[PDB]
């Protein structure tokens, strides 16, 4: 046990006022930290560790700083050494050394801090408290990509499930620098570790705009075709989180093209994510809607729904995307036809039936409603058996409302009746709708407090009332009084159809 008088005396030498003495101690201690036997003897001596920590941060001798930092680094490979570093106030010192202009000292500091963050308890809160986050974010402008990979992983460990840390990164200009890493470098580890930080940051809603405004959507989209599976996946997850706040963000065309390509991926998780992002990005943005249509997005989304089967995780976002693409833009009509031309109508109608759950059904009804606007879809939708199921769904939804799975039954009623309203433009469809004994139900919907349900219920009744016999059955059901009431609505749409039904009942 040579450490009986070797360690204590060496501790004193490090504590000496003469720099040259301290320097000689530092180099020796540093060598002692390279062997299991002698390194253990340093770990068992807090006084020694304290001396190293103090020297490292206080010294103006670069070799000493290097040797003291390297010693701590060597200790950090073991449980005992990590705990020794922790308890001797190593972390604040290590954080301080992140300002070092010496690369070796800086690299020892980050590596040691990384090890502490990975393996030592209390290390995260200690680093946070010592102002580590600000430091680490300011270091993201360094050019060594291996250094950046370690730094970004430290941030990930700090930020994960910690609002304090996330907000500090946001405050310190973290998104800007992180997004810059993703647009500049090609080192896979760095891109990977950076993506996981941006993912953590992308979770909270208030945090998303900073990543978006910096150009994060495009920077993330840049790596979607990269060989790395883990990189692509993290980019996709982040993009999907962000895409809720990037619905009005401009310049998304390149990304959208790639997302449509990704729908043809062998990896189902890739397809699911791509569909989800496309769903988000196409919502209330005509440029995004148009772009997706131009690159054959309809075919891809139809084929995705077909390929998905009863996987509602995939069909729901795919159907939603299609619903977005079939309304309120220049190529909505092209899109409505495309769904038919690419053999979508069979599967779209199929999804109305069980075992589909309400969120999907709601989206599917909305899509069918849009598809019905195209006259060429009237007969195919009928021939696929859309009318009976639409009625059946309307009936079940009406019973409750005379939230299920997070879906209002009022929205199902409105959506089903709205679809039937559009379908009832076709004479053959009107025959089917009448044949299902829908007149009494539609008249009851005139009593609804919701104006949109009143409009579509009167709307469908209007269409049906074209036939004289149907008009008699509507009058016979006692629609006149509700209609007369609805004639005075401030909602012009409701009042228009109310007047129309009364008129057709009178001729």
């Amino acid at each position: 046990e040579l450490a009986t008088r070797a360690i204590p005396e060496l501790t004193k030498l490090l504590n000496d006022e003469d720099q040259v003495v301290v320097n000689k101690a530092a180099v020796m201690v540093h060598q002692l930290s390279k062997k299991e036997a002698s390194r253990h003897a340093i770990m068992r001596s807090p006084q020694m560790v304290s001396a190293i920590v103090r020297t490292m941060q206080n010294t103006n001798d670069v070799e000493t700083a290097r040797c003291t930092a390297g010693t701590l680094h060597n200790l950090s490979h073991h449980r005992e050494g990590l705990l020794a570093i922790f308890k001797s106030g190593g972390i604040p010192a290590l954080v301080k050394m992140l300002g070092s202009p010496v690369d070796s000292v800086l690299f020892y500091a980050i590596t040691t801090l990384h090890n502490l963050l990975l393996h030592q308890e209390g290390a995260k809160m200690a680093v946070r408290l010592a102002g580590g986050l600000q430091k680490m974010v300011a270091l993201l402008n360094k050019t060594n990509v291996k250094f950046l990979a370690i730094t970004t992983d430290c941030l990930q460990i700090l930020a994960y499930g910690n609002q304090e840390s996330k907000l500090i990164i946001l405050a310190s200009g973290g998104p800007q620098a992180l997004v810059n890493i993703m647009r500049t470098y090609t080192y896979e580890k760095l891109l990977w570790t950076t993506s996981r930080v941006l993912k953590v940051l992308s979770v909270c809603s208030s945090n998303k705009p900073a990543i978006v405004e910096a150009g994060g959507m495009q920077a993330l989209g840049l790596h979607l075709t990269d060989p790395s599976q883990r990189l692509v996946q993290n980019c996709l997850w982040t993009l999907r989180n962000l895409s809720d706040a990037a619905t009005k963000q401009e310049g998304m065309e390149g990304l959208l093209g790639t997302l449509v390509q990704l729908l043809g991926s062998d990896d189902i998780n890739v397809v699911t994510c791509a569909a989800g992002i496309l769903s988000n990005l196409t919502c209330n943005n005509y440029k995004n809607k148009m772009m997706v249509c131009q690159v054959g997005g309809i075919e891809a989304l139809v084929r995705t729904v077909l390929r998905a089967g009863d996987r509602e995780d995939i069909t729901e976002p795919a159907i939603c995307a299609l619903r977005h693409l079939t309304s309120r833009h220049q190529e909505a009509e092209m899109a409505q036809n495309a769904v038919r031309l690419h053999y979508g109508l069979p599967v779209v109608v199929k999804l109305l039936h069980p075992p589909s759950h309400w969120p999907l059904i709601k989206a599917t009804v909305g899509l069918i409603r849009n598809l019905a606007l195209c006259p060429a879809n009237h007969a195919p939708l009928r021939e696929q058996g859309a009318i009976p199921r639409l009625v059946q769904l309307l009936v079940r939804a009406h019973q409750d409302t005379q939230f299920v799975e997070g879906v209002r039954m009022e929205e199902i009623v409105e959506g089903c009746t709205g679809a039937l309203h559009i379908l009832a433009r076709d004479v053959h469809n009107r025959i089917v709708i009448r044949g299902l004994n829908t007149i009494p139900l539609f008249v009851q919907l005139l009593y609804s407090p919701i104006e949109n349900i009143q409009r579509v219920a009167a709307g469908v009744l209007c269409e049906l009332a074209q036939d004289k016999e149907a008009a008699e059955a509507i009058e016979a059901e006692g629609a006149t009084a509700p209609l007369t009431e609805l004639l005075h609505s401030r909602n012009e749409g409701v009042a228009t159809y109310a007047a129309a039904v009364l008129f057709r009942m009178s001729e």
Partner: peptide
Amino acid sequence: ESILDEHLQRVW
């Protein structure tokens, strides 16, 4: 630079 390389090999 070997500081970083050796660390990378430990962690990942």
